[PDB]
PDB file of C-alpha atoms in Angstrom:
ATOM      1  CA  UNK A   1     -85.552 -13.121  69.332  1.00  0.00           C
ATOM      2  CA  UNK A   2     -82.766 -15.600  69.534  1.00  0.00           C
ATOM      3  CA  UNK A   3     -82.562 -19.236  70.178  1.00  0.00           C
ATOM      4  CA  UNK A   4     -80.449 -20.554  72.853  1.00  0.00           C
ATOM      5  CA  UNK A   5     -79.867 -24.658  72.906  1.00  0.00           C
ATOM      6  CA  UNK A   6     -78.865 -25.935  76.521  1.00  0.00           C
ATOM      7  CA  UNK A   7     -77.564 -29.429  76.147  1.00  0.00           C
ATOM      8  CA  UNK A   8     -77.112 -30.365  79.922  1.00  0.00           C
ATOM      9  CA  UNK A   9     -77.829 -33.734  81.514  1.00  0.00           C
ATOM     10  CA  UNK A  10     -81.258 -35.045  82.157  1.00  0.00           C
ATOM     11  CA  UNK A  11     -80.664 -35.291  86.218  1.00  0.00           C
ATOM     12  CA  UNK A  12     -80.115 -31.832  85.788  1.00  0.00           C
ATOM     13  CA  UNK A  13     -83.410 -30.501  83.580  1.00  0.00           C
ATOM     14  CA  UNK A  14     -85.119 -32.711  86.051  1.00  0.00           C
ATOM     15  CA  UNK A  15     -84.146 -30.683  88.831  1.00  0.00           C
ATOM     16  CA  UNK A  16     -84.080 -27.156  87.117  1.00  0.00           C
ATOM     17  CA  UNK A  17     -87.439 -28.071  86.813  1.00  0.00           C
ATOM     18  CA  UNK A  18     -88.820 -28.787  89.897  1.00  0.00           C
ATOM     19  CA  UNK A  19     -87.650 -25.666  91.562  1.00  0.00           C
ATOM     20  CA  UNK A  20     -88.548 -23.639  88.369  1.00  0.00           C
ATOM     21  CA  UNK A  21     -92.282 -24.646  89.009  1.00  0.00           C
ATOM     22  CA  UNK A  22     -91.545 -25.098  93.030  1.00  0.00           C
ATOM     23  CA  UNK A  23     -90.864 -21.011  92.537  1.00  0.00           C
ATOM     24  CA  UNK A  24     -94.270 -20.415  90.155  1.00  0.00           C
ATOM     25  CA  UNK A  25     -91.927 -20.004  87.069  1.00  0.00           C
ATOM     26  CA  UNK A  26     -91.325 -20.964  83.624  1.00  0.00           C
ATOM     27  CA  UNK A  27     -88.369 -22.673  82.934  1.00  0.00           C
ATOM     28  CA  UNK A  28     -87.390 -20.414  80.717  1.00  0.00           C
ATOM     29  CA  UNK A  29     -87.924 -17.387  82.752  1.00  0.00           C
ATOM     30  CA  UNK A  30     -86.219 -18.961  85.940  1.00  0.00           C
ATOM     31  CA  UNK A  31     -82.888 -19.807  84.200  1.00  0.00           C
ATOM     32  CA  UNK A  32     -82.719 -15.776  83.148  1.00  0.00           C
ATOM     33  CA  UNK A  33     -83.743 -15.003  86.101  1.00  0.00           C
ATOM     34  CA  UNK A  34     -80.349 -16.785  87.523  1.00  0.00           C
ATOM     35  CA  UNK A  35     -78.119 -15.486  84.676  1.00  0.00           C
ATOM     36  CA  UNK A  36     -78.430 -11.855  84.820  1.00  0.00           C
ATOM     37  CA  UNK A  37     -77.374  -9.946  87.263  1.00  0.00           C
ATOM     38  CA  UNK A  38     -79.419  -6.376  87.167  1.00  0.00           C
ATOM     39  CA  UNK A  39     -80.340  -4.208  90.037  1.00  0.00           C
ATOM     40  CA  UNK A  40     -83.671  -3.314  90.923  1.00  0.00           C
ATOM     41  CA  UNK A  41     -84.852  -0.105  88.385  1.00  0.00           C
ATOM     42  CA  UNK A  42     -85.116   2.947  89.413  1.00  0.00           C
ATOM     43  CA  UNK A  43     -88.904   2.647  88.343  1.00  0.00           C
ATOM     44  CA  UNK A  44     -89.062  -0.141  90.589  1.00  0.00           C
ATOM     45  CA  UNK A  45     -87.256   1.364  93.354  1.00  0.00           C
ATOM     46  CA  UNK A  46     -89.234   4.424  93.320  1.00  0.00           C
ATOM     47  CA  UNK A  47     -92.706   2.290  93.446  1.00  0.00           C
ATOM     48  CA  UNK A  48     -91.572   0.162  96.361  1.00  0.00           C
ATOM     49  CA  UNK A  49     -90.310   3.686  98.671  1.00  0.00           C
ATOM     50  CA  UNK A  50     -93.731   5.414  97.843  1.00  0.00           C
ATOM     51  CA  UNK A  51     -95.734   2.054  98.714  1.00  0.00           C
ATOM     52  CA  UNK A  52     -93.826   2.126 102.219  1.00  0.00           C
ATOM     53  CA  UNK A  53     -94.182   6.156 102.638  1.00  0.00           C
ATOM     54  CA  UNK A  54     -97.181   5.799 102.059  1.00  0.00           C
ATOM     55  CA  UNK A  55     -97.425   3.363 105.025  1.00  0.00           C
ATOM     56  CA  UNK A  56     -95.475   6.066 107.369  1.00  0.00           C
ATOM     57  CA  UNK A  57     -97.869   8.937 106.641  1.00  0.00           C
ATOM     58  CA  UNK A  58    -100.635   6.418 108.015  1.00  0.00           C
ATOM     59  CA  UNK A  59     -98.393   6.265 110.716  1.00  0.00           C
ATOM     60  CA  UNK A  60     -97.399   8.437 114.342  1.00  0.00           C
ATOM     61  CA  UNK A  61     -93.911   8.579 111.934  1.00  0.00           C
ATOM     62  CA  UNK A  62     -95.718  11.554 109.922  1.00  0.00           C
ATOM     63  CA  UNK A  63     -96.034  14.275 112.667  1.00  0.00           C
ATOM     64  CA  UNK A  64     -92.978  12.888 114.402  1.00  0.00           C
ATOM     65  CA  UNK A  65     -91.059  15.860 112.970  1.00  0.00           C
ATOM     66  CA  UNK A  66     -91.062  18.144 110.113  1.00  0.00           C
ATOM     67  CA  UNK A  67     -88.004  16.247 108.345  1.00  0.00           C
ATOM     68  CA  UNK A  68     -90.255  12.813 108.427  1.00  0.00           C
ATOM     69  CA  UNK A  69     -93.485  14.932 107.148  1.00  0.00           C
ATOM     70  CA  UNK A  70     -91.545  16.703 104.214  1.00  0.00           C
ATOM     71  CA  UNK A  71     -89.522  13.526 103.271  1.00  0.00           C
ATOM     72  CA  UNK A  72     -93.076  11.227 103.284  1.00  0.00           C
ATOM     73  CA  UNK A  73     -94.564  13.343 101.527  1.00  0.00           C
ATOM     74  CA  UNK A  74     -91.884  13.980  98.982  1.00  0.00           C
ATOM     75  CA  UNK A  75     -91.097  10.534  98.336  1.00  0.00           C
ATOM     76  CA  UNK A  76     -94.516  10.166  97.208  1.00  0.00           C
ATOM     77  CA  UNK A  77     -95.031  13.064  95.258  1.00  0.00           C
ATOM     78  CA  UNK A  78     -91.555  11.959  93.328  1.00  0.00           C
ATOM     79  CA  UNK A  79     -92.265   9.137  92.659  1.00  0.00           C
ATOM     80  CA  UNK A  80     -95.795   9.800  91.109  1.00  0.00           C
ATOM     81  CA  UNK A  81     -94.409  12.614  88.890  1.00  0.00           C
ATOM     82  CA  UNK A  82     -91.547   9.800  88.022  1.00  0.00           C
ATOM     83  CA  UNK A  83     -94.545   7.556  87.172  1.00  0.00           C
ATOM     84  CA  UNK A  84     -96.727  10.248  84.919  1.00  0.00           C
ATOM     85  CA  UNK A  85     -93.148  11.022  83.363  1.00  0.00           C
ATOM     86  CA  UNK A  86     -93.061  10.984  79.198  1.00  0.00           C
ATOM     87  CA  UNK A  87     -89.759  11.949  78.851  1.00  0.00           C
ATOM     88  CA  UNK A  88     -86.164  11.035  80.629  1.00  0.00           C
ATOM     89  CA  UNK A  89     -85.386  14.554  82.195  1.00  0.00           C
ATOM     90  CA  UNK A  90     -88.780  14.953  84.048  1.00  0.00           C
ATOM     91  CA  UNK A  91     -87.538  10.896  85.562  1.00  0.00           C
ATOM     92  CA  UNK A  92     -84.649  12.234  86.036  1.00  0.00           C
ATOM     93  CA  UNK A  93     -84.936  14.936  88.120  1.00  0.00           C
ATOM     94  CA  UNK A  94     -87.764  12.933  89.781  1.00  0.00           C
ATOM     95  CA  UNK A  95     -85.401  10.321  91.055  1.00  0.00           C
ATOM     96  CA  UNK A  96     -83.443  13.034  92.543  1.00  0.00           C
ATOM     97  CA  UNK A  97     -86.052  14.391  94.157  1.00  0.00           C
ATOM     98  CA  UNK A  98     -87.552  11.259  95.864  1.00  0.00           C
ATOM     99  CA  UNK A  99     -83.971  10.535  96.990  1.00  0.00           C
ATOM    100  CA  UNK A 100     -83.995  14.013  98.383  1.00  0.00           C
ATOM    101  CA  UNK A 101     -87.220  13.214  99.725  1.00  0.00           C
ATOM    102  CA  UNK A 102     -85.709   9.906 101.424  1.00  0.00           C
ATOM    103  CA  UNK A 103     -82.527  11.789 102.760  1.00  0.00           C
ATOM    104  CA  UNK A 104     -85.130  14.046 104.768  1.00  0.00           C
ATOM    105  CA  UNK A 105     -87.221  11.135 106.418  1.00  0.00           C
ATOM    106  CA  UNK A 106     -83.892   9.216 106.865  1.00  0.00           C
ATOM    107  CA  UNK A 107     -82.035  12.358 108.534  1.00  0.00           C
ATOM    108  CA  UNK A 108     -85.428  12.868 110.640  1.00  0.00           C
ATOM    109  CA  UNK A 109     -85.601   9.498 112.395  1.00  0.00           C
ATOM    110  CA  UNK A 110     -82.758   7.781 114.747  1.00  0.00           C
ATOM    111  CA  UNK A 111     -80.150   6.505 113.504  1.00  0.00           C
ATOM    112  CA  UNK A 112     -80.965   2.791 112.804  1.00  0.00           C
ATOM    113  CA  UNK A 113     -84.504   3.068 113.976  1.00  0.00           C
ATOM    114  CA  UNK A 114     -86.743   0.537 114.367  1.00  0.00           C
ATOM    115  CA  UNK A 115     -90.040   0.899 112.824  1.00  0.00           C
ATOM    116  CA  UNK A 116     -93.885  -0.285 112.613  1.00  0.00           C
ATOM    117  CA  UNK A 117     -96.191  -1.118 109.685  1.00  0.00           C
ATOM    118  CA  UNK A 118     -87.461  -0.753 110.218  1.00  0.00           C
ATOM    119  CA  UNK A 119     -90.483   0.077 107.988  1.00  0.00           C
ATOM    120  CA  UNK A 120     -88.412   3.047 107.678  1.00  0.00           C
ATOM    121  CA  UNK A 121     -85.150   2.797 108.904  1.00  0.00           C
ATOM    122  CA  UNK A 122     -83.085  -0.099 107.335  1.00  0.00           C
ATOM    123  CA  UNK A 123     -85.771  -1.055 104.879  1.00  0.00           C
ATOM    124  CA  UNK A 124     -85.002   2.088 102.865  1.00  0.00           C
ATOM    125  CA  UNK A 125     -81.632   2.743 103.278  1.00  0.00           C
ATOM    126  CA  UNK A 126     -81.009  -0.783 101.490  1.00  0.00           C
ATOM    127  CA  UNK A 127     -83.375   0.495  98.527  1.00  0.00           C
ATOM    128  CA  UNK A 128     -82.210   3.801  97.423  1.00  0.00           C
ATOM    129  CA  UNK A 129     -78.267   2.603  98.420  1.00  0.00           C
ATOM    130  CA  UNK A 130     -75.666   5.165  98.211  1.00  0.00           C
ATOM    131  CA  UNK A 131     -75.606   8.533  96.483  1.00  0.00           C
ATOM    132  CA  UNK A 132     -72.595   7.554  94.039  1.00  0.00           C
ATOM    133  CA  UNK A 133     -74.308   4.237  92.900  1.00  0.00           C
ATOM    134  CA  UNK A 134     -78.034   5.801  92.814  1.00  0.00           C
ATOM    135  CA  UNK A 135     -76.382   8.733  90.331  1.00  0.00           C
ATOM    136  CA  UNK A 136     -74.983   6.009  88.060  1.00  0.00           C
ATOM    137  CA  UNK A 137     -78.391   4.055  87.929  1.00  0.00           C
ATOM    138  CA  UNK A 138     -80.247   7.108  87.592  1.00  0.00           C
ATOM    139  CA  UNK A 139     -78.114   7.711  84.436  1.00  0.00           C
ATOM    140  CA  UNK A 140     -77.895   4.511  83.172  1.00  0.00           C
ATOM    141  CA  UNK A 141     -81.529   4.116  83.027  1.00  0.00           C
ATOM    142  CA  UNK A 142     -82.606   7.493  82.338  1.00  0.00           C
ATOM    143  CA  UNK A 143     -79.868   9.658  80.466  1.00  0.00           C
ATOM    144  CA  UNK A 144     -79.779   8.077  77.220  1.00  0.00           C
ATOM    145  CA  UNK A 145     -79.878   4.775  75.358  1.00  0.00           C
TER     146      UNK A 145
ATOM    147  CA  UNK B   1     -78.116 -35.673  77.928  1.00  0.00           C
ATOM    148  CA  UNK B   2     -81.019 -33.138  77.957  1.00  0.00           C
ATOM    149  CA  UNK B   3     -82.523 -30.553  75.701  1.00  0.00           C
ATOM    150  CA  UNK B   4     -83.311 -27.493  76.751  1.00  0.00           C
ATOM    151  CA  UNK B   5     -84.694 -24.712  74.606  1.00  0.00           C
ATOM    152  CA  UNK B   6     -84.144 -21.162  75.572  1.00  0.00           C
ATOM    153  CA  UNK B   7     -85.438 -18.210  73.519  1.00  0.00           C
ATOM    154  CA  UNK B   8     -84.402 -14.657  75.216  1.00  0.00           C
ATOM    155  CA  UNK B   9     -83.829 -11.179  72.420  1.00  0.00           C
ATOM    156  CA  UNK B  10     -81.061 -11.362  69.969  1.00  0.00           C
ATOM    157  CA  UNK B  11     -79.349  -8.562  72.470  1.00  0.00           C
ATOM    158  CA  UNK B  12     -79.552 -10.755  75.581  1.00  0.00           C
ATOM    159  CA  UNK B  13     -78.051 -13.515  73.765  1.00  0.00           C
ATOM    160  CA  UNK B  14     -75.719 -11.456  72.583  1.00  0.00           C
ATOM    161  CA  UNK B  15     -74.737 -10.291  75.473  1.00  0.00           C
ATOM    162  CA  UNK B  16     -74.445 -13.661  77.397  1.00  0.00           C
ATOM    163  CA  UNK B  17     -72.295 -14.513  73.996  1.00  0.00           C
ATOM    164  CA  UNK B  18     -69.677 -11.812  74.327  1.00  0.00           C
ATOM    165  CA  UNK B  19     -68.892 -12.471  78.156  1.00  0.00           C
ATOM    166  CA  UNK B  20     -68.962 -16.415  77.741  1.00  0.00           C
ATOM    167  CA  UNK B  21     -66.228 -16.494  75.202  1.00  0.00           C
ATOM    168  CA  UNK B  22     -64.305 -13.500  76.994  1.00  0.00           C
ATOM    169  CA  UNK B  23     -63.950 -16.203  79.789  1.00  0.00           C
ATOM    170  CA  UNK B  24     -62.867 -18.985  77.184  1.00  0.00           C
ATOM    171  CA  UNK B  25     -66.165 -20.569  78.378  1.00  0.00           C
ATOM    172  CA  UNK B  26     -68.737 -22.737  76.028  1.00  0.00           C
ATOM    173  CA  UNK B  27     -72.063 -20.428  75.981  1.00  0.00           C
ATOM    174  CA  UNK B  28     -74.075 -23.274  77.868  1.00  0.00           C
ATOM    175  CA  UNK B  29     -71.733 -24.207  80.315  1.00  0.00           C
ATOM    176  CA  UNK B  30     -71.339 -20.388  81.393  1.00  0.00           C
ATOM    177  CA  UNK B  31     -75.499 -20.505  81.583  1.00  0.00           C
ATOM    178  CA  UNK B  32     -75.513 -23.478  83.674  1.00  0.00           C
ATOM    179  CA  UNK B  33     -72.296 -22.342  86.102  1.00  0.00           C
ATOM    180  CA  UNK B  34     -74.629 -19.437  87.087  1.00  0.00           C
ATOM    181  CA  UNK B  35     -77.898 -20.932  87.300  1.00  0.00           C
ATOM    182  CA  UNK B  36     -76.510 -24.077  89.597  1.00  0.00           C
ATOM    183  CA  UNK B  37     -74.919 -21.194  92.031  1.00  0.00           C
ATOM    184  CA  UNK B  38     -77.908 -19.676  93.358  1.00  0.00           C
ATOM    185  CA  UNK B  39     -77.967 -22.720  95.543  1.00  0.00           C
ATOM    186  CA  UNK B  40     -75.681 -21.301  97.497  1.00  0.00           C
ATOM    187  CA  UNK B  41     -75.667 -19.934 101.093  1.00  0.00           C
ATOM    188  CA  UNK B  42     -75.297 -16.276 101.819  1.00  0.00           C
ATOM    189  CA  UNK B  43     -71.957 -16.647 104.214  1.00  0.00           C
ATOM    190  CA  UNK B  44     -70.416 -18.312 101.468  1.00  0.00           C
ATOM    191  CA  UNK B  45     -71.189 -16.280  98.493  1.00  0.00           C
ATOM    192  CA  UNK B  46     -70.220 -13.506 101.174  1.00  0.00           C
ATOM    193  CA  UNK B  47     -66.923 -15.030 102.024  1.00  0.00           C
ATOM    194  CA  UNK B  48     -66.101 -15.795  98.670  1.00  0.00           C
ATOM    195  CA  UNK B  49     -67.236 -12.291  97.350  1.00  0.00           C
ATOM    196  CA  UNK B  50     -64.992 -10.591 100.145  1.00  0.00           C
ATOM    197  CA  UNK B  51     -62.082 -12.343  99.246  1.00  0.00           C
ATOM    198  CA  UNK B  52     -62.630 -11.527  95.534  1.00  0.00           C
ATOM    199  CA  UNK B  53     -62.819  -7.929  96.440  1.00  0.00           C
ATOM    200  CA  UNK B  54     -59.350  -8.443  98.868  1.00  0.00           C
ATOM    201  CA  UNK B  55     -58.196  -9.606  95.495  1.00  0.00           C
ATOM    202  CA  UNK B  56     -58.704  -6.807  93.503  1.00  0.00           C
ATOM    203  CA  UNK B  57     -58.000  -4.265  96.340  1.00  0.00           C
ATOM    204  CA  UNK B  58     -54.000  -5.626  95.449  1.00  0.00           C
ATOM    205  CA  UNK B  59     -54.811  -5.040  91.849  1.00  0.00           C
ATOM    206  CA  UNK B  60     -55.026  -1.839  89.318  1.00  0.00           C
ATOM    207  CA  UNK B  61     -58.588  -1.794  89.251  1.00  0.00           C
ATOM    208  CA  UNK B  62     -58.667  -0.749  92.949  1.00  0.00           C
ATOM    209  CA  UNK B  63     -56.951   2.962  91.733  1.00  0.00           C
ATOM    210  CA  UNK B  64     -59.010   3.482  88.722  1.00  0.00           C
ATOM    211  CA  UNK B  65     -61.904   5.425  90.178  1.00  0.00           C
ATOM    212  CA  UNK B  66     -63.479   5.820  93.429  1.00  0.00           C
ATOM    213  CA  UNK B  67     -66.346   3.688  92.360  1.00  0.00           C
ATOM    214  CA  UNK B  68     -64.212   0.806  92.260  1.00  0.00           C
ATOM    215  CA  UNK B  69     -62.065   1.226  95.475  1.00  0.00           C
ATOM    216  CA  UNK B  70     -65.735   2.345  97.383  1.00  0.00           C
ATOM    217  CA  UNK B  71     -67.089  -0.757  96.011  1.00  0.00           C
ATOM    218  CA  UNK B  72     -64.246  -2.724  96.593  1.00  0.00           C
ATOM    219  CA  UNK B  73     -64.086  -1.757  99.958  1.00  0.00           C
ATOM    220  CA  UNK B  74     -67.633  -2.126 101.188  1.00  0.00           C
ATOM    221  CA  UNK B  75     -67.884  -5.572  99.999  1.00  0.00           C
ATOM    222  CA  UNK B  76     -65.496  -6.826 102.251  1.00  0.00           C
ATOM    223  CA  UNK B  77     -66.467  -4.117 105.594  1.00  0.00           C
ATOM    224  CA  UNK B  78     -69.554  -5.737 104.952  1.00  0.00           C
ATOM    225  CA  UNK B  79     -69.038  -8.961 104.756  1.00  0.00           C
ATOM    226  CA  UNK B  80     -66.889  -8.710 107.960  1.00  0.00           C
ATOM    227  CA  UNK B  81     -69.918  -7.092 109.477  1.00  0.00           C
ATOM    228  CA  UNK B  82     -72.129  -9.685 108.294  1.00  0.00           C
ATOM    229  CA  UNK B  83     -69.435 -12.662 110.110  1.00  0.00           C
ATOM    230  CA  UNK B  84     -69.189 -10.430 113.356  1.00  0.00           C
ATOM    231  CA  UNK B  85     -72.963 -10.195 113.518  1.00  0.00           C
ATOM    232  CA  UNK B  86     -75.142 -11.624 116.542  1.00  0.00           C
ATOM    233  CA  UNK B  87     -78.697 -11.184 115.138  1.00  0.00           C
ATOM    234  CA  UNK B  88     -80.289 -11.593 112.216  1.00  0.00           C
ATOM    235  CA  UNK B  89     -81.721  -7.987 110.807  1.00  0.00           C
ATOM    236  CA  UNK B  90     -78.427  -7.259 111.270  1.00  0.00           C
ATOM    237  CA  UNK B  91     -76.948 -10.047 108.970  1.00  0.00           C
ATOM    238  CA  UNK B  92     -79.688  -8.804 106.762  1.00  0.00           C
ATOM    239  CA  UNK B  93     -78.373  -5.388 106.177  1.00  0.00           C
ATOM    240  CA  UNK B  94     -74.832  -6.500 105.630  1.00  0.00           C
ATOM    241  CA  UNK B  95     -75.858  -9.048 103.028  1.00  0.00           C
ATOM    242  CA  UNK B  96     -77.918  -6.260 101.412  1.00  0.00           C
ATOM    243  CA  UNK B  97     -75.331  -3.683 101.224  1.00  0.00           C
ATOM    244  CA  UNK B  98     -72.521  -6.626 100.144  1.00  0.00           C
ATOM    245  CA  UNK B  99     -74.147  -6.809  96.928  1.00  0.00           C
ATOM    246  CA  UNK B 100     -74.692  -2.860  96.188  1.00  0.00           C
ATOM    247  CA  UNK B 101     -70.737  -3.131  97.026  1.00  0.00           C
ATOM    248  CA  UNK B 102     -70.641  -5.049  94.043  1.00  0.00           C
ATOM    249  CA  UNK B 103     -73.160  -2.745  91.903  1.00  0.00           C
ATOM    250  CA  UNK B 104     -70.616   0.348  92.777  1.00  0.00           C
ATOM    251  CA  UNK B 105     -67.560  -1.748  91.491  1.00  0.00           C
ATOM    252  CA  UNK B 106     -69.610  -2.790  88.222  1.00  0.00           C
ATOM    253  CA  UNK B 107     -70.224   0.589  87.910  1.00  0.00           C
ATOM    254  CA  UNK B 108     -66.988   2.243  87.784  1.00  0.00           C
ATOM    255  CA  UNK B 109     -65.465  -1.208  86.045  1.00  0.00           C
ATOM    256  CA  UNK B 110     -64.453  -0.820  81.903  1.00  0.00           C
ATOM    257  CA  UNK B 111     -66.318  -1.676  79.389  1.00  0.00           C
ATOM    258  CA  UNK B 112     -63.916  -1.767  76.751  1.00  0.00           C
ATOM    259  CA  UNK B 113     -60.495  -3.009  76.037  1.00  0.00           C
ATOM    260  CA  UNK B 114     -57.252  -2.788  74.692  1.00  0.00           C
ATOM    261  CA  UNK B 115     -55.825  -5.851  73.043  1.00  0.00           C
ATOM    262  CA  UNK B 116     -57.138  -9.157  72.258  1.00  0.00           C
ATOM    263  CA  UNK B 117     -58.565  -9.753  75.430  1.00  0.00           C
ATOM    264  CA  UNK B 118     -58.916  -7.402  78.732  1.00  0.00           C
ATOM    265  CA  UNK B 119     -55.906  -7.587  81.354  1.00  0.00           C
ATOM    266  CA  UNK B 120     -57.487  -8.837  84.136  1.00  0.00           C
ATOM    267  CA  UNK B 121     -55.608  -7.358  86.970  1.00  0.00           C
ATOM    268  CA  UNK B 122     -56.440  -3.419  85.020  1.00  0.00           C
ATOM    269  CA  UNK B 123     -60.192  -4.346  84.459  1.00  0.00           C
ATOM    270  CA  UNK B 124     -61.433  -6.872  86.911  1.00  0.00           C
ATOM    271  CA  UNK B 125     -63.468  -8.364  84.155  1.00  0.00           C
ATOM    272  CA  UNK B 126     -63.660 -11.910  85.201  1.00  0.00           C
ATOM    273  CA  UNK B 127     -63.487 -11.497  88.947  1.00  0.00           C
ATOM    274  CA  UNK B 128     -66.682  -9.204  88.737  1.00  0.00           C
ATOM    275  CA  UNK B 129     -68.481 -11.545  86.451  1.00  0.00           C
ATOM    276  CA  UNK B 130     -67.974 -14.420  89.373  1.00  0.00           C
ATOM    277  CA  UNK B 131     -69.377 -11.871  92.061  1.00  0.00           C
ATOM    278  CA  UNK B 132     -72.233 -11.341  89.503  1.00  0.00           C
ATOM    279  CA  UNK B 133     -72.503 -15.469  89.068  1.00  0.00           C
ATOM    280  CA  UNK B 134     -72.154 -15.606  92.918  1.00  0.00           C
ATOM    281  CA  UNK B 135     -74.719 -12.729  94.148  1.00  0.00           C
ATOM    282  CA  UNK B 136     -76.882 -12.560  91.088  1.00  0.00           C
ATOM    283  CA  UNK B 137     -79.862  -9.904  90.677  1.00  0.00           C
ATOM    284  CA  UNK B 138     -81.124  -7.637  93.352  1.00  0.00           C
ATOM    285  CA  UNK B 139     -84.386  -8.871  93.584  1.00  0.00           C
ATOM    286  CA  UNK B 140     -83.102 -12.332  93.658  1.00  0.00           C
ATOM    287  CA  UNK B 141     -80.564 -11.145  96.320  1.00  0.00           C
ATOM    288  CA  UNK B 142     -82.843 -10.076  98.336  1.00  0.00           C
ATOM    289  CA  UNK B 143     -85.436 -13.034  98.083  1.00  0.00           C
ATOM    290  CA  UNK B 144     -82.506 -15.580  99.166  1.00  0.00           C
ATOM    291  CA  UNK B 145     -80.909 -13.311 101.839  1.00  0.00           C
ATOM    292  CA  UNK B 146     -84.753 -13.142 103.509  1.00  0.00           C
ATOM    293  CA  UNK B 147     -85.294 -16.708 102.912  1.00  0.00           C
ATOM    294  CA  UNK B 148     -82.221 -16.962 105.512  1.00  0.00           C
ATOM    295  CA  UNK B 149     -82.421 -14.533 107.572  1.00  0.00           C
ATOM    296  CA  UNK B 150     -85.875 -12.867 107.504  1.00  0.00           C
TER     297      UNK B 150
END
């Protein structure tokens, strides 16, 4: 741990405080929260797509077509085996997978769809991104320290 | 003037070190530029972000990999999508993919140097840390661009 000493003027705590508690934060914790500048994890991304595939298979979505079924069902299965994961290759090819899993709901529904608790559509194209920028994350986070 | 103790890991601090006085900046006021601008609105960071990226388009950076020029690019297609929008979810999804513009760039930038300090026009090092200062973290991204437009 490491000590940081922010000398800035006392209008200014005053008001970094108020919106760090008008947020529900610690002081501390809200002015990292500002500096840094990390994307969401893959661990995090892979929680949120399973939470919403799970929505879709409780959904007309999941016998829409076979591409939605296999890419619901994928997604989740991914991202559990991510989840139970105690080593970096299993995540690895995990995170592949459940991308695999969202290029086959994706590919089954209209292009820019809208969906119903898109649910689907935009929703989860903004989470797993690209294919060049989920490969570097996917290493970053998972293919070494 | 005001005290404010921070205590984050010796790495983080480090880290927020290393960058500040690559810039020529004091440590605090490099913290406080970035905290104060989260304030701002998503068209501007957008339009400022867009003409960062036209910046570096002109520059080196843009030929050193494809995740730079892809980055580079969809920052400003996006932005420009975001400005010619007429609804909101669709504002949405531009901001959105604005900022993982700016995660490709990051991640085909350097991340080391020759020479005292890195050439800024063959590394983009200081223009990507003010599109980091302007668009922040995802999640925080994404929290401000619903607050907006959601």
């Amino acid at each position: 741990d490491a000590l940081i000493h922010l000398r800035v003027p006392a209008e200014v705590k005053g008001r970094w405080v108020k919106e760090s508690r008008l947020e529900g934060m610690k002081l501390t914790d809200w002015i990292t929260g500002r500096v840094e500048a990390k994307a969401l994890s893959i661990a995090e991304v892979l929680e949120e797509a399973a939470a919403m595939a799970r929505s879709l298979e409780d959904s007309p979505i999941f016998y829409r077509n076979k591409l939605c079924a296999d890419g619901i069902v994928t997604i989740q299965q991914q991202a559990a085996r991510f989840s139970a994961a105690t080593d970096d290759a299993t995540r690895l090819d995990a995170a592949l997978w459940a991308r695999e899993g969202y290029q086959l709901l994706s590919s089954g529904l209209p292009d820019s769809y809208s969906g119903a608790v898109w649910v689907t559509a935009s929703q989860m194209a903004r989470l797993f991104g690209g294919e060049a920028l989920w490969i570097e994350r996917c290493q970053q986070e998972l293919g070494g320290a």
